[PDB]
C-alpha cells in the first residue's frame, strides 16, 4: 500500500544528516502528518502558509509565465525548505527543516 | 558609514559570490561526495579516476605548478605554489589559496618574485603558511590578515640556502616561545629555521656530504615519531638519518642512479616506504634493517613526477609521471601491474601529485600552471574493516606484511 | 626473465634442463620489441630532448640519451643463432647513435665554454659538476664559486637597503652614497658600501625620531 | 678586569650580582664556591662605563660604553650579541638610571645634556622561574670545574 | 493524488538536503580566530632631551 | 642554549650504560664486539654534533675551555673533527 | 577596490542577469541593467518577502535571526542577502 511508501519517504528525507523535522500542510493551513509535537506544528502551519503564498504572488506578479517550484529560508540554526506545487485538486507544500551542524 | 564601502557588504557579497558559484557547478560537487561507480563491482581487476574540479587563474598559464598542500581544519583548503622547473624559463612565481567552496577565483592570493618551490601549512594552529624560492629566500606568509605581502623573509644576514629550497615543514613546538622549520637545498644541506622576534634565524643540522656537498630534492619524516626522516639526493642514492648527526646516514638505502623525485611513509607500518625516481621506476622497500635491497620494483615508460601512499591504505598507492597518465597501484590485487592507468591531461607533462585524508579525491599538477581534481573509484579504495576483537591498523598491517613476504621469498 | 630464472631453480630434470635453454628466444623477441621502441625515442627527439628537472641545456641532454643507452644494455648482459645476428646489428647501431650524442654535444659544450665565459655565467661553470661525473673536463674548471654566489648574495642585498633608507626621506645625504654606489677589487667596494648605509641607517631614524 | 665601573645586585626574583664594569659585561653569583662569573657576556669594543638591570623584567641589562650605547641586552634568548644597538649620542655616554616602573631610561653625555628614551612593550614578562633556572644550573658547571683539577691532580 | 504528490516533493526535496550537505557554503573561514603573530622589535624613542 | 644540549649529552649517556649493561652478559663475542664498536663509532658523532652546535655560541676566549674541558676523550675519531675547530679559535683570538 | 572587483567578477557568470543594492526604504543604488523599468520592480518587491521571511524565522525562538534567503522560480533563481543596512539581490538562471 502506497501508505508505506510515503512514511517509507519520511525516513528516507529522515536518515539524512542533520534533518531535524519533515512536515506536510495543504492549502488550508492545517498539517496532516507532522513530526514535532502540536503547538511548533500549528505555528509553523499558519507562518508558512502565509508566507509562501505571499512569495508566489511576488513571483507571479514580477512575471507572468514563471511559477516557483522551490523555496530557501535561512537561519543560524537551521535551513527551512520549503517546497510547494501549486496545483488543483492538490497544492502541498512540504517544509522541512534541517542543518549540517549536528552528529 | 558610506554604505557602499561598509566592511560586511563586502562579507556577505564574498558568500553570495559563492552561493552562486555552487550553482553553476552542482554536478560536479555532488558527485564528489554522493557518487560511487557502479561498474567496479563487475570488473575486480581495474579502476578509473573520475575527473572533477578544474581550478586555473589567468596568471597561472605561464607558471607551472610547483606544489600542492592541505589545510589540517576545514577540508576544502589547498596551496597551489606556481612557479618553474626549466633551467631557461626562469619567472617570479606565484602562490594561490583555493577552495571548495568556489572553484572559479581564489579566495586568497600573493605574488612572489621567484619560483615557489615549496609550500607548507602549519598543522596545528591552521593558517601560517611556510614557503620557499628559487633563491634561497624561505618566506612565511599569515593569511587572515589580508595584507599580499609576507609577516617574515629571509636575508642574505639571517641566513639563506643559496640555491632552490626544494622542502620545507613545519615541527610542534610544544607551547613554547617558537614555531620551527626544517628545510633542503641543493647546495649545502638542512637547515632549521625558528620564528623569533621579528626574523627567520638558521641553525645547520646536517650536511650531505659524498666535488661539493652532494645535491637533492626532497625529504620525509616519519609521522609516529619526530627526528628519522629520509632524503634524497642527486648523486643517487636515498640516505635515512635523525635529528641529530647520529651515525649520519642511519641507513643508506642506496639503489639508483639518478635523481630520486619522492619519498613517502605510510601512516600504518611503520618501518615501510616507498620512493621514486628520474629513473623511470619507484621502489617500495623496508627500513627497520634491509638496506642492501629492494623488496620490488615496478619499471614504467617515463620518469616519475611524484608518489603518494594512499592516507586510507597501506596498500593502495598512486604515482605521477612524465606523459599525461596517472597509475594508480593496488599493491595487494594486481602483483606489478599498475591497478588504473588513465590518462587526464592533453598535452602537458604532469608532476605533482598529493591525496586528501578525510574525503577521498586526490590533486594531480600539470607542467602548464594548472591543478585538476580527480576522485577514486571504489576497487582503489578498500579498507578491511575493522570488527570486536580486532583493530584496524593491525589488519593493515598484516596485508602489507603478507605481500612483503611473499615477493620476498618469490624474488630469491 | 626472472620468472625463467626461477623455474630453472625449482626442478631438476635434465630434459627440462635442456628446455628452459629454449625460450630465451621467446625472451629474445620481447627485447627486440623494446629495442624497438627505445629506437623510436631515439630519432623522434633527436635535436629537442625532455630532460629531468632544473637540468641545464647541454649536458642536461646528454643523461636522457644515456638513459635510453643503459635501459636497453643492461638487459642485454643477460640475454647473451641467426635471428641473434640480425638483433645484434639492430643493437649495434642503436650503440653507435647513443654515443653519437654523448660526444657531439660534448664537443658543443667545449665552443661554448669558450663563448659564454666572457646571466648565463653560471652554465659554464655550472655543468662542470654534472660533466665531472663522467666525461672529461675543460680550461678553468670551477675552482671560482667559493666567492661568486657570495657576490651575488650580499650584493643584491646592500642595494637592496638602499632602497628602503631612501623611503624615509621625504640633499647632501644620499650624495656621499652615490658617490660610493658607483665605482679582484670587488671586495673593498664591498666593505665602503656596507660601512656607508650603517651611517645613513643611523642618521636617518634619528631624524625620524626627532621629527615625529 | 681593570678600574670596575659596574655593581648591581639582581632584583624581581633572586641574588645574583652583576659586574658591567669593565670591557666584559659578566653576571656573577654569591657563593663560597663560585668566585667566577655565571653567564659570561661578550667581550666588547670600546672600554665599558655604566648600567644595570630591569625591576619589571627578569634579567636584561644594558651597557653604556666609551662611544655610546644602550644595548638592550635580552638575556634569556641570545647570550653572545647585543639584541639591541642604539647609539644615543656620539659623545661618550656617563650614566644610567632606570624608572622604577620600567620603560624609561636616561644618560647624560660626554659633554652636557641628559636624553631621556623609552623602551616599549619588550619590558613586561610572563614567566618569572626558568631565568632564576638558566642562572642557577649555569654555574654548577662551574663547581663541576672545581672537581676536575683535584681529580686531575690526585689522578 | 496526495500521495504521488508527496512522492514527488520528497524525491525533489531529497536532492535538495544533499545539496545541502555536499559541501558547507555558509562557512566563513577563520570567523573567530584571536591568536595573532606579529612584529615586535624594539623601539627607542627619545621624549624629550633634558637640556 | 645548554638546556637541549645538556638533555642531549644525557641521551648519550643513558644509551652508552643500557649497551654495556647488555653487554654484561667463547669466540662468538667477536659479533657483539663488533656491534659495540658499531655503536662507539656511532655515538660518538652525538658529541660532535652537540659539540659543533655549542662551539659558535662561546662567547669569548674562554668560554671554550669551559666547554672543551667539561669532556676532556682524545681519539682518532674526534680529532680529525677538531683540527678545523682549534683553527677556529685560532682565528677568532686573532679578529 | 575590492567591492567593484567582487560585482565585476559576479556580473560575468553563465548565467547572472543582475544585480542589485537597495537601502533600507528604497532607493536601489548600484545596479546593472541597461534599462530601468523592471529595477524598481525588484526594489518594491523584494524586500517584503525579506523582512517577512525573517518575521517566520525570528517568532519560533527569539534567539534565532534571518541572514539568507532563496527564491528558485522555474526560470530564475532570485537570492537575497538581507539584512540591517539594505537587502541586496542577484538573480540567476542556473
Known sequence: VDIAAVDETFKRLQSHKGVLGIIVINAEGIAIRTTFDNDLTVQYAALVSHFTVKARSAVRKLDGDNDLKFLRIRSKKHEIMIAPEFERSHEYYLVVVQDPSRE | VPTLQSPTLMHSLGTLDRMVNQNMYEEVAMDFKYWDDASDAFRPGEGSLLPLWRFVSDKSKRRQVTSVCWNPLYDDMFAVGYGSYEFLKQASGLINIYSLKNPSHPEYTFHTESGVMCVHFHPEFANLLAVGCYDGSVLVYDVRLKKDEPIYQASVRTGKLNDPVWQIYWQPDDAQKSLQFVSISSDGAVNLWTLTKSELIPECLMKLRVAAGGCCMDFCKMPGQESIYLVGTEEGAIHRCSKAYSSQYLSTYVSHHLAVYAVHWNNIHPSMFLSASCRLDHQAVGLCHDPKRAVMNFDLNDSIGDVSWAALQPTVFAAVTDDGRVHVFDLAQNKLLPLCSQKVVKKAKLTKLVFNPKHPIVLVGDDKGCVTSLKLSPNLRITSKPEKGQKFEDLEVAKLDGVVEIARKSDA | ?212 | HGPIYGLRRNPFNSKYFLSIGDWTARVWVEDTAVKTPILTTKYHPTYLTGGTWSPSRPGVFFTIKMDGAMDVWDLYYKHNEPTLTVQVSDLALTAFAVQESGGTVAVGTSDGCTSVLQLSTGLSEASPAEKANINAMFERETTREKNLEKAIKEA | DYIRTVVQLGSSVEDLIKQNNAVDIYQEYFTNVTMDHTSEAPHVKTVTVFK | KGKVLTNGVKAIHQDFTSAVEKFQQAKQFDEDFFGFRVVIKELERRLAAIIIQAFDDCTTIGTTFKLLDSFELDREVIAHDLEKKHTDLLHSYAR | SDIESTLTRIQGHKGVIGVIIVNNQGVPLRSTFEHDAMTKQYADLVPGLADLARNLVRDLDPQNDLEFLRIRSHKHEIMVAAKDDFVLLVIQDP
Open chain 3, 1 to 212: 626473465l626472472s620468472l625463467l630464472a626461477q623455474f630453472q631453480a625449482i626442478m631438476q630434470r635434465e630434459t627440462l634442463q635442456q628446455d628452459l635453454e629454449n625460450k630465451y628466444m621467446v625472451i629474445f623477441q620481447n627485447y627486440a620489441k623494446d629495442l624497438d621502441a627505445v629506437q623510436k625515442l631515439y630519432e623522434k627527439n633527436k635535436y629537442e630532448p625532455p630532460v629531468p628537472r632544473n637540468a641545464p641545456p647541454v649536458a642536461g641532454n646528454i643523461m636522457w640519451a644515456r638513459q635510453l643507452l643503459r635501459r636497453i644494455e643492461a638487459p642485454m648482459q643477460l640475454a647473451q643463432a641467426k635471428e641473434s645476428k640480425k638483433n645484434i646489428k639492430t643493437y649495434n647501431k642503436v650503440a653507435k647513435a647513443l654515443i653519437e650524442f654523448e660526444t657531439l654535444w660534448h664537443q658543443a659544450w667545449i665552443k661554448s665554454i669558450e663563448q659564454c665565459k666572457a646571466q648565463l655565467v653560471r652554465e659554464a661553470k655550472y655543468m662542470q659538476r654534472f660533466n665531472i661525473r663522467c666525461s672529461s673536463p675543460s680550461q678553468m674548471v670551477l675552482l671560482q664559486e667559493e666567492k661568486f654566489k657570495f657576490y651575488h648574495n650580499q650584493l643584491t642585498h646592500l642595494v637592496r637597503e638602499y632602497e628602503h633608507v631612501l623611503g624615509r626621506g621625504a640633499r647632501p645625504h644620499l650624495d656621499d652614497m652615490e658617490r660610493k654606489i658607483a665605482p679582484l677589487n670587488i671586495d673593498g667596494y664591498l666593505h665602503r658600501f656596507k660601512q656607508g648605509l650603517a651611517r645613513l641607517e643611523e642618521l636617518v631614524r634619528k631624524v625620524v625620531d626627532l621629527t615625529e
